[PDB]
Amino acid sequence: MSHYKSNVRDQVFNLFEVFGVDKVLGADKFSDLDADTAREMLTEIARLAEGPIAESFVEGDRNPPVFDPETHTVTLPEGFKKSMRALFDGGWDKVGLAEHLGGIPMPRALQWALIEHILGANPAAYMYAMGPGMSEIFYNNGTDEQKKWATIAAERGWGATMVLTEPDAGSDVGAGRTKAVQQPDGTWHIEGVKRFITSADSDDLFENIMHLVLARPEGAGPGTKGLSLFFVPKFHFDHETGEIGERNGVFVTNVEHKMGLKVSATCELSLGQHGIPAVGWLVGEVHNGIAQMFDVIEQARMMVGTKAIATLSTGYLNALEYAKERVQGADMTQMTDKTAPRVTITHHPDVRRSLMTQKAYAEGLRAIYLYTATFQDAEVAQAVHGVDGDLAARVNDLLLPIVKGFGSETAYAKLTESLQTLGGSGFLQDYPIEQYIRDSKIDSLYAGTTAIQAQDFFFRKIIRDKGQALAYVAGEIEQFIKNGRLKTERELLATALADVQGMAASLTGYLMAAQEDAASIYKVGLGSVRFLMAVGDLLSGWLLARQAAVAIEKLDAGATGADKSFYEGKIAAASFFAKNMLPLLTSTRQIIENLDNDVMELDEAAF
Amino acid sequence: SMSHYKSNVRDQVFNLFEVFGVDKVLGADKFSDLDADTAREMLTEIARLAEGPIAESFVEGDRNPPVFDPETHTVTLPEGFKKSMRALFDGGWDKVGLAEHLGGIPMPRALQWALIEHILGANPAAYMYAMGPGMSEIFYNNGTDEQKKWATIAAERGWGATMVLTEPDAGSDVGAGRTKAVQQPDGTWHIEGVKRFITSADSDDLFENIMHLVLARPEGAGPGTKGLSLFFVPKFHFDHETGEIGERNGVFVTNVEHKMGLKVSATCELSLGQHGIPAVGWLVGEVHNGIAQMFDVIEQARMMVGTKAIATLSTGYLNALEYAKERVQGADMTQMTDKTAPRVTITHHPDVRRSLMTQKAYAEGLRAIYLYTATFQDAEVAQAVHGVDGDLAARVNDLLLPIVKGFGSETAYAKLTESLQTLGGSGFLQDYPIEQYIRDSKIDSLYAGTTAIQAQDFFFRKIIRDKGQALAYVAGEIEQFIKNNGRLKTERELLATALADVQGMAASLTGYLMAAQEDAASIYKVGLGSVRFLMAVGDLLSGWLLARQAAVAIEKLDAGATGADKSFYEGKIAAASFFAKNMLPLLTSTRQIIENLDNDVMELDEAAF
Ligand SMILES: CCCCCCCCCCCCCCCCCCCCCC(=O)SCCNC(=O)CCNC(=O)[C@H](O)C(C)(C)COP(=O)(O)OP(=O)(O)OC[C@H]1O[C@@H](n2cnc3c(N)ncnc32)[C@H](O)[C@@H]1OP(=O)(O)O
Ligand SMILES: CCCCCCCCCCCCCCCCCCCCCC(=O)SCCNC(=O)CCNC(=O)[C@H](O)C(C)(C)COP(=O)(O)OP(=O)(O)OC[C@H]1O[C@@H](n2cnc3c(N)ncnc32)[C@H](O)[C@@H]1OP(=O)(O)O
Ligand SMILES: Cc1cc2nc3c(=O)[nH]c(=O)nc-3n(C[C@H](O)[C@H](O)[C@H](O)COP(=O)(O)OP(=O)(O)OC[C@H]3O[C@@H](n4cnc5c(N)ncnc54)[C@H](O)[C@@H]3O)c2cc1C
Ligand SMILES: Cc1cc2nc3c(=O)[nH]c(=O)nc-3n(C[C@H](O)[C@H](O)[C@H](O)COP(=O)(O)OP(=O)(O)OC[C@H]3O[C@@H](n4cnc5c(N)ncnc54)[C@H](O)[C@@H]3O)c2cc1C
């Protein structure tokens, strides 16, 4: 069929058998959505993804968008716009939208499971379809008058952008210099150049685009605290009827040539530089821009991590299908007999090692983002964890940089194994793995680099949090550890939990010691990404072991056939991950415990 | 990026002269007519040519890739890339290390691969196209007297060459190939089959002829690699006396692959005797010894591929470093709470220094590894610089090749991830060369034998079949460095742990092999651990060679180095110390993992994956 190989079975196993999300289906906010309907929804969008969405995956990469300087617009390849129309015609751009904007109320964990299929099949398609979701964010932060415009924007399916980055302001958002000048009538004129804006033009997919633009009001203070957020539409419109009016002064000037994700137009965006003003409306009519924009960034970060995990999953399943059919070499137990029967390559230990590595990380990462999503609804977190609203928000905030940072880094790294499994054929564009790699490289960069994820995780999600979310998660792991067929895995998990706790203590010591010895803080920076990755590995190992515990229960109860095979794979993956990935965390702890500032004191000229 | 290529002659000369003492042999015996000054001038010259005319078409070759005409069975290469090829030819760089009697300049292999590194960093496909004369020398070495005259012609005319092994069903398992050879009464052979993934099988109008060295199975020969013979199959027939090109021979490209990277290297389906015209082949050396003869070629290809990956990581790192030096973003971490603190260049950030020193230490440790390996590729160099005789040097070179290839390919691709990350969002742009470095280097874990095949060769052939003699030699050199100022005390302690870890890995895997005498399935544990073992030995060699470099750097600083020299030597100490403290300890956990491998993953139903 298509390049995209989906895994609804594993999503349903997580949602229902592991986390118990079906417990809230049929109750309260989700009163009208039952478990059967949720499963039909996943199967339906999986088929959409495997069909018309994936159909244009190759085309978007081989025949990428073209910038037109004669009109300051972008043209998209026809096959990809056909895929977009399939997404829209099915109403999938209203996934998880609030009911009053036309959505179907559902748990976030189900919402992200639906979205995984789009991100695996053609992830730029989800990015162009995020308009109604961003209109909901504008609604939540807007005045009563602005909530009327957001409703129009959602109902009409306008596109949307998030507009922060400038040539000199990427990780350091607060350095932005785009300016906002209030006009007598209460609107603002926005002036500046922004860079790397995803979907800044989208051909004729939509009748309008809502740009949500960070800019600094004249006279405002420095840094991110001096930023405000502005609603800046591509076209002016009638605030009552929605009728599209005159062009607004916000124009793309270039489209970047990228390693991958080529069909996502990534644009320099000029505001008020082409002779008409870029009129913006202060969101909520309050000056609170970085806090408002982080509502969007949080979702972008969830999407980026889920995208990376979706891509690893279809990479693994492509590699697995290939390995099952590729005949090459003799069985290793017959390697000295040059007339021995040839075997398929799944018989080779290094290939089974590779495949189980891909499998355990893909499925561990899926469990992680679905686990994370179970904290994004108060009702779900109460129902399935017994955790109240405040703690749930802090745990979600803790896990987001794991989904994003650990997800992006891990998926790209393990796709290397997926390609390797194809041999020389993995290097061909004939197979989709090399495009998976190119498309996923950006996931460690956009929505905040890995280093920024790791700094967020430690300084904000742990230290500022006074460790409360982290202690909750460590307690659940400890509970699992304390509890026969999983005794070895629980012992390996106990070592890994202790290692992560040791890392956290060492970095906390380096931070606290910076009050008297300022350079001590550098050791936190030196260790931060490795710590983030260690926590990701610990969470993967724990959730895999929890899956294997469920699988043991189901096999004991008499699972047969394809179910039995699935459950056997969960036990194998949990055991392989505990025995081959978790122990490296001990060496990483000892490395972190011995970090020093030699590398910081070295003259720059010595590099 | 046009001038994408950033060279490092200074580090090459440091290794060649200050660390390994390869100048000990320059001006003596086989190298009597090449002195150290000349060697350094050659490195400077090809590095300048690489940074200029060769690198000039690096982007062009990827963005305007070769185009196949299926009716002429030929490829057209972009003009800018052919201009780069002519610059290489006009300088004689396709004859680096060629025997004097073939028109070469005799030189140590360590110098030859250091020269080639610059071409591989600037435009690696250019060197692949230019390997013809080196092939001709291998053909010369393996040929009859008469073939030696043809090889001499081919080298003097600069013919291109290919190595033709792979078929759709015979990649890792070379012995499965079905291409056949049909003996003719006059002693020639007619070759019949379809080969796949053949690099340079057509090369536009770069050459007047191409020598295809083709593995094929004589009718009625036995199975496996042992049944294969090697055939000289020219693209054009030619006058065996004068070299004048004659009738087109029956060997035709029928497809050119669309690849992730290395796009300018035409990778070809090659049809032999399928178009009603015989593919005439001449039996190499007029003996049936094909897989042994072809491994002369494979050995050089594996060395090249490892050197290519390392060359590419080096320029990726130097590009990231020059970017990081200029990019202002954020406040110093000591001022992160003060939102009015001065902005700093990103080399001030701990994670960026960590990233950069990771790239540096791996790029420089890998350079030391391939140059160390090359010092064993001449008996006279191995004797002068290491005091080892010809037989042990060959076994040590053989031990190290899968490390250069397997560990070099895997490591370079992985650490280029850090190089790209250093550029931030800009690293994802084609405006910078790192994303093409990544795509171009992914192939290096695959062609010339996959990493799994490298690790299996390393363990079974280069350790077990060798009775551990080469490994024991290397380990003994590491042990002596550890035993020998206490300024490298911590590094030596860390290397001692890493050496014991690698020895423990080797003992575990050897134990699994011994157990396979009793339970055949125990051998699977060797396969499960083999790649991790090969990578561990690479880390150990990197950490050791960097520490040796640190010891020389300490001597030079003590003697009073100043200026740029001083900065260079300080960076060697920092790299060796960073690598010992951040890379080597992981080998302890890897050893423990290998000590506990089991066959659960082998017994699992394939359906459960
Ligand atoms: C259908 C479902 C319902 C509908 C809604 C859901 C749909 C969502 C739609 C969104 C889609 C997104 C994608 C859009 C389409 C195209 C795809 C594009 C993908 C990626 C695109 C991008 O790259 S956008 C640019 C991303 N840039 C970054 O992420 C910035 C990276 N740098 C940093 O994060 C730095 O660390 C910052 C900038 C934070 C450092 O500045 P600072 O030193 O001033 O920060 P601070 O002092 O630490 O805190 C300042 C201020 O900021 C708030 N804050 C910080 N960190 C926060 C986190 N992690 N979470 C929330 N808020 C955060 C905070 O208000 C703080 O104030 P205080 O609380 O400290 O007082
Ligand atoms: C000194 C520096 C100066 C150098 C100058 C440069 C000169 C080079 C010029 C090049 C000419 C132009 C060429 C242009 C090409 C440019 C691009 C190249 C890109 C890479 C292209 C490729 O990929 S070519 C295809 C590569 N294929 C492989 O590598 C094969 C992978 N599979 C394996 O290796 C398997 O492990 C094999 C096939 C070996 C398993 O078969 P088997 O089970 O039958 O093997 P065995 O029983 O273990 O051994 C059989 C036979 O083979 C000999 N042998 C095996 N392994 C050897 C090694 N490592 N080294 C030498 N010989 C080896 C051995 O003869 C054995 O017989 P026994 O000795 O055991 O009795
Ligand atoms: C495909 C793509 C799409 C994008 N889409 C959008 C979009 O829709 N909207 C938008 O607003 N932006 C968008 N961006 C911008 C993107 O978020 C930025 O590229 C990213 O935040 C990194 O910023 P930068 O590129 O300026 O890199 P830099 O900030 O210059 O980072 C360079 C290097 O320095 C490191 N570094 C920087 N500061 C620190 C620090 N304080 N501590 C430690 N290390 C540090 C980084 O980790 C990185 O390794 C997009 C980018 C890409 C590539
Ligand atoms: C760009 C490019 C250029 C090339 N140029 C040439 C050339 O000039 N000449 C030439 O002869 N060939 C050439 N090749 C072929 C190349 O050497 C083969 O692709 C390579 O040997 C792998 O073989 P394969 O692709 O058939 O993969 P397979 O052998 O099918 O390997 C598939 C997977 O199975 C694994 N596997 C296979 N056998 C075993 C085993 N026994 N034990 C454990 N794991 C195993 C592999 O490691 C890999 O992960 C080229 C290939 C490429 C991609």
- Cβ–Cβ below 8 Å for A223 and B340: yes
Question: Rounded to a whole number, what is the distance in Å from the CA of A469 to chain B's nearest CA?
Answer: 23
> Which of B344, B352, B432 best tests ligand 3's pocket when mutated (most atoms within 8 Å of CB)?
B352
**Left (φ > 0), alpha (ψ -120 to 50) or beta: where does A494 sit?**
alpha
**Is A416's Cβ below 8 Å from some Cβ in B?**
yes
DSSP characters over B408-433: HHHHHHHHHHHHHHHTGGGGGBTTST
Q: Which of A157, A250, A236, A129 is nearest to A200 (CA)?
A: A250
CB A264 within 8 A of CB A199: yes
Mutation for A interface: B260, B460, B573, B591, most A CBs within 10 A: B260
**Left (φ > 0), alpha (ψ -120 to 50) or beta: where does B71 sit?**
alpha
**Protein residue with least CA distance to atom 14, ligand 3:** A196
- Pull the structure tokens for residue B590: 């890897």
Cβ(B426) – ligand 3 distance below 6 Å: yes
**Is A324's Cβ below 8 Å from some Cβ in B?**
yes
CB A29 within 8 A of CB A230: no
> Which of B112, B174, B211 best tests ligand 2's pocket when mutated (most atoms within 8 Å of CB)?
B174
**Protein residue with least CA distance to atom 42, ligand 3:** B349
Beta bridge partners of B280: B190
Q: Of B329, B450, B598, which has the smallest distance from its Cβ to A423's Cβ?
A: B450
* CA angle, residues B43, B44, B50, in degrees to nearest 5: 85
- Cβ–Cβ below 8 Å for B528 and A350: yes
- Cβ–Cβ below 8 Å for B581 and A599: no
CA quadruple B496, B498, B503, B504: dihedral, nearest 10: 110
Task: Write the DSSP symbol of residue A449.
Answer: -
| Residues of A in Cβ contact (< 8 Å) with B528 | 349-350, 352-353
Cα B426 to Cα A206, A304, B121, B429: the distances in Å are 28, 18, 21, 5
Buried b (16+ CB within 10 A) or exposed e, A181-208: eeeeeebbbbbbebbbbbbbbbbebbeb
Q: Which of A278, A263, A291 is nearest to A58 (CA)?
A: A263
Closest approach atom of ligand 3 to CA A167: 26
- Cβ–Cβ below 8 Å for A587 and B582: no
Q: Of A327, A519, A603, which has the smallest distance from its Cβ to B570's Cβ?
A: A603
Please name the method used to determine this structure.
X-ray
Beta bridge partners of B215: B230
Cα B466 to Cα B306, B391, B394: the distances in Å are 22, 12, 11
Query: What 3-state class would DSSP assign to A461?
Result: helix
- Cβ–Cβ below 8 Å for B435 and A438: yes
At the fourth CATH level, the homologous superfamily of domain A8-134 is Acyl-CoA dehydrogenase/oxidase, N-terminal domain (1.10.540.10)
What is the CATH topology of the domain spanning B141-149+158-288?
Answer: Butyryl-CoA Dehydrogenase, subunit A; domain 2 (2.40.110)
Cβ(B312) – ligand 2 distance below 6 Å: no
**Protein residue with least CA distance to atom 7, ligand 3:** A197
**Is A584's Cβ below 8 Å from some Cβ in B?**
yes
Handedness of CA A166, A167, A171, A175 (dihedral sign): negative
Name the residue ranges covered by the structural domains of chain A. 8-134, 142-151+158-287, 449-607
Q: Of A258, A441, A565, which has the smallest distance from its Cβ to B607's Cβ?
A: A565
CB B577 within 8 A of CB A598: yes
Contacts within 8 Å (CB) and 24+ apart, B40-46: B40/B9, B40/B13, B42/B111, B42/B115, B43/B9, B43/B12, B43/B13, B43/B111, B43/B114, B43/B115, B43/B118, B44/B9, B45/B91, B46/B91, B46/B93, B46/B115, B46/B118, B46/B119
Q: At how many degrees (to 10) do helices B290-326 and B350-374 cross? A: 150
Secondary element (H or E) of residue A193: strand A188-198
Closest approach atom of ligand 2 to CA B163: 13
| Cα A204 versus chain centre, distance | 27
Question: Rounded to a whole number, what is the distance in Å from the CA of A605 to chain B's nearest CA?
Answer: 6
* CA angle, residues A444, A447, A449, in degrees to nearest 5: 40
Q: Which of A397, A392, A403, A396 is nearest to A366 (CA)?
A: A403
Q: Of A175, A423, A445, which has the smallest distance from its Cβ to B343's Cβ?
A: A175
CATH of B9-135, one of 1.10.540.10, 3.20.20.80, 2.60.40.180, 3.40.190.10: 1.10.540.10
**Is B477's Cβ below 8 Å from some Cβ in A?**
no
DSSP characters over A262-282: TTS-EEEEEES-SSS-EEEEE
CB B18 within 8 A of CB B36: no
Residue B361: is it exposed, middle or buried by C-beta count within 10 angstroms (0-12/13-18/19+)?
Answer: buried
- Cβ–Cβ below 8 Å for B333 and A522: yes
CB B398 within 8 A of CB B474: no
Q: Which of A351, A359, A577 is nearest to B609 (CA)?
A: A359
**Is B608's Cβ below 8 Å from some Cβ in A?**
yes
**Is B592's Cβ below 8 Å from some Cβ in A?**
yes
What is the CATH topology of the domain spanning A142-151+158-287?
Answer: Butyryl-CoA Dehydrogenase, subunit A; domain 2 (2.40.110)
Question: Rounded to a whole number, what is the distance in Å from the CA of B33 to chain A's nearest CA?
Answer: 36
Handedness of CA B200, B201, B204, B209 (dihedral sign): positive
Residue B523 carries which side chain, given as an amino acid letter? I
- Cβ–Cβ below 8 Å for B523 and A444: no
Query: Looking at the CA of A335, which ligand is closest?
Result: 2
Cite the beta strand spans of B61-170 per DSSP E. 67-69, 74-76, 160-164
CA quadruple B496, B500, B506, B508: dihedral, nearest 10: -160
CB B416 within 8 A of CB B437: yes
How many angstroms separate the alpha carbon of residue A369 from the centre of ligand 1?
A: 18
CA distance A112 to B119: 48
> Which of A162, A408, A439, A445 best tests ligand 3's pocket when mutated (most atoms within 8 Å of CB)?
A445
CB B379 within 8 A of CB B320: no
Q: Which of A212, A214, A232 is nearest to A176 (CA)?
A: A214
CB pairs under 8 A between A and B: 264
CB B150 within 8 A of CB B161: no
**Resolution in Å, one decimal place:** 1.9
How many angstroms separate the alpha carbon of residue A452 from the centre of ligand 1?
A: 11
Handedness of CA B323, B326, B332, B338 (dihedral sign): negative
Question: Rounded to a whole number, what is the distance in Å from the CA of A335 to chain B's nearest CA?
Answer: 10
CA quadruple B582, B588, B592, B593: dihedral, nearest 10: 30
| Residues of B in Cβ contact (< 8 Å) with A124 | none
| Cα A375 versus chain centre, distance | 16
CA distance A32 to A11: 21
Q: At how many degrees (to 10) do helices B523-559 and B489-515 cross? A: 160
CA distance A404 to A395: 15
How many angstroms separate the alpha carbon of residue B328 from the centre of ligand 3?
A: 12
**Is B342's Cβ below 8 Å from some Cβ in A?**
no
Residue A313: is it exposed, middle or buried by C-beta count within 10 angstroms (0-12/13-18/19+)?
Answer: buried
Mutation for B interface: A304, A350, A355, A464, most B CBs within 10 A: A350
| Residues of A in Cβ contact (< 8 Å) with B325 | 604
Q: Of B225, B351, B443, which has the smallest distance from its Cβ to A525's Cβ?
A: B351
- Cβ–Cβ below 8 Å for A259 and B169: no
Within 166-195 of A, beta carbons closer than 8 Å to B belong to 168, 170-172, 174-175
CB A100 within 8 A of CB A138: no
